[PDB]
Design a protein around this ligand. Structure first.
Ligand SMILES: CC(C)COc1ccc(CNC(=O)N(Cc2ccc(F)cc2)[C@H]2CCN(C)CC23CC3)cc1
Length: 331
């Protein structure tokens, strides 16, 4: 931004999207650190994800906005177009790995449940980050070696090599997304089955108590006991509310994880479908429209990196109360 030579000033109004992308994720990072009730494997995963998304807003988004200002004619030195692209390939990938891990271990938690949690979480964070780095690192070598895989028509900074686009999309989007979807569906199936036994019998006995009838209560508690000693006596508050609250908290967490995964794939599918379709027909297609659509779908995918904190705010008292108190107390 010299600013001499700019071409699209209203694009500066995208800074708001950037400002919230960092801060919201910061609010997650401030939360999972300063709130003791957020110290666990999944919330540490979410802190890592917030770091990745804040870095998206800090490094991937601002260069894209600067390029938009100059009408997609790379305004920075030529050695920064590869880096930026690779940084994209890094941070976004981490996200789709983190979610894929969050849905995977969860499934591996439900199947065969049986170091410490706060350390195996570190191991998984390291694994997903290393995968992201391994995907990102080749891009600068390819770009700085052959500047035609990262520059299109000598001015536009987009990934150009077809084989790399396809292979990276299949190994960084389609495989992680597929694992995420399959694991989440199997998880949400098994959870319903395990919960079903207790909730059906409990509903039977609760309805029979609601009448006053009483003869229809004993077998319900028998079946619930079979599925510990809170039902053998039968009072309703303690053991019922204890085990029933544990099930429902899990249901809420499953809803949140599904919403995060689903916002992610909904917001990133347009860009990926459009790109792999722009290469499915290297000719015979209208490439101008493909590029113009991709220039907006890329930012939809970017904006996905600032929505998960709002999901936490909408479905967590801890995160919401954190965010409010952090905003007012710190400044
Ligand atoms: C040399 C090979 C191994 C690595 O080469 C690769 C090629 C493509 C991909 C798929 N990833 C993307 O298409 N992204 C990042 C992304 C990453 C992960 C996601 F889950 C979503 C998007 C877009 C995002 C928008 N940027 C402007 C350009 C882009 C970088 C290309 C990954 C690796």
């Amino acid at each position: 931004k010299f600013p001499d030579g700019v071409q699209n000033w209203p694009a500066l109004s995208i800074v708001i999207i950037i400002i919230m992308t960092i801060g919201g994720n910061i609010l997650v990072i401030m939360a999972v650190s300063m709130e003791k009730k957020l110290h666990n494997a999944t919330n540490y995963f979410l802190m890592s994800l917030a770091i990745a998304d804040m870095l998206v807003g800090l490094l991937v988004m601002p260069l894209s906005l600067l390029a938009i200002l100059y009408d997609y004619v790379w305004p920075l030195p030529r050695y920064l177009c590869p880096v930026w692209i690779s940084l994209d390939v890094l941070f976004s990938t981490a996200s789709i790995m983190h979610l894929c891990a969050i849905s995977l271990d969860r499934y591996v938690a439900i199947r065969n449940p049986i170091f410490n949690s706060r350390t195996k979480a570190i191991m998984k964070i390291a694994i997903v980050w290393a995968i992201s780095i391994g995907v990102s690192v080749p891009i600068p070598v390819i770009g700085l070696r052959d500047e035609e895989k990262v520059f299109v028509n000598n001015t536009t900074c987009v990934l150009n090599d077809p084989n790399f686009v396809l292979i990276g999309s299949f190994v960084a989007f389609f495989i992680p997304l597929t694992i995420m979807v399959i694991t989440y569906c199997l998880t949400i199936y098994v959870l319903r089955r395990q919960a079903a036994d207790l909730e059906d019998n409990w509903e039977t006995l609760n309805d029979n108590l609601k009448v006053i009838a009483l003869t229809k209560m004993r077998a319900a508690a028998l079946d619930a006991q079979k599925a510990r000693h809170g039902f053998d006596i039968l009072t309703r508050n303690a053991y019922i509310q204890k085990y029933l609250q544990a099930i429902n908290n899990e249901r809420k967490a499953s809803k949140v994880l599904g919403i995060v995964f689903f916002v992610f794939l909904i917001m990133w599918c347009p860009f990926f479908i459009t790109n792999i379709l722009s290469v499915l027909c290297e000719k015979s297609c209208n490439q101008k429209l493909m590029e113009k659509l991709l220039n907006v779908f890329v930012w939809i995918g970017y904006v996905n990196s600032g929505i998960n904190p709002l999901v936490y705010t909408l479905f967590n008292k801890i995160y919401r109360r954190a965010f409010s108190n952090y905003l007012r107390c710190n400044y």
